[PDB]
Amino acid sequence: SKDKVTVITSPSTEELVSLVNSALLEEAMLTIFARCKVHYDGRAKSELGSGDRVIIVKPDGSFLIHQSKKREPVNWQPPGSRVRLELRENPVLVSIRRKPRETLEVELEEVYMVSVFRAEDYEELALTGSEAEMAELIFENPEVIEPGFKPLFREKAIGTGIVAVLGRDSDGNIVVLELKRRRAELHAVRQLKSYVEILREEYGDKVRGILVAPSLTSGAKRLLEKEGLEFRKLEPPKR
Template structure:
């Protein structure tokens, strides 16, 4: 069996077999098809007929791309359950309950890539480094802030940092290493609402990022959430290595 298996104009039965193969061997499936897309969860949406690229990864990630823009038009996160029912590829996210259905009208090709990749991306200026900076210097958030937990599991996800302010209020920090958008605000609000069920109104939510989109700023204000501007830390090791190289060539 090779690394890449390609079928052009497969039947729906062949599509099912390819998905089974990918599931068994941990492959990535890419489907090129004319389709309709339906979403049902925190809201409802429908995307009419068109040519799309559907990507399904071994961890349950499910992406639907159009022929424009960088971001998928619809997606489901890792941990979602993917199946094929009739002529549709269906992805179910359990908590919160979300369903994404792609109705296949005409399948042009299916590619299964049996990828092997065991390396982790080492990011400079990552959210992990932002968290480390905040624990070492909590005053970058505000005076009197005390971070207590990092990656704290709660009812609807995992909070980046959870702590208390000088008045004893619970403070949730959602960290973003790039410009924060509406999705980041919605994520923070879910966490705040979940903890308010346990702690009442003494819960604050703060989005921490280098900048905000205009839409995110308006939604933060509407929901009574806060923002702190914080740039991800730079990689001092690389900076020092670069300086030593300059010194070597400039004695």
């Protein structure tokens, strides 16, 4: 019975059903290559005409449909969904999501391959260069901002919003940082500017916003300078 992989090319309906249902029940990865048509209804609504795609169903209920291009799936369902195979004029893979109600229907016109991959993964990703690690860097070593900077809070909620880092300078002013792990764009400045306005209410005009990022878009620089805010160039560190 059980090897990591079970493949059948150009399978019978009996074989299809056999494997598909076995995948769902054994909680393993179903992969399929097929000519299909897709029907999605949910937050938005979509239609995809006949063509060959890859289809993946994870044991956690995530459902992917990949065309020959891009990175993103053309259609999907996120983890937690429930899938059932339905026999009709053609077999149909059907994933239902509750909360929000969403339906994905993959009509299988021709199945070129069905497979069951019983995959064992105990390892999880280890990633460095996050903005969280920027914050770790700053709290360990505040001078990367400027002399006498005193970081105090992280992900601190002010009244409306949550600021990346809140602290004080050598003059005793409230200081806001918004951090970005890549070049900072207009929404970055809008974030900072938003937090500073709100802080100016309690603490007055003392308050300095600083954008901390490796670089800055032209439009970000403009809006920064128009609003009298500051920029510290900082690269996110790699372990």
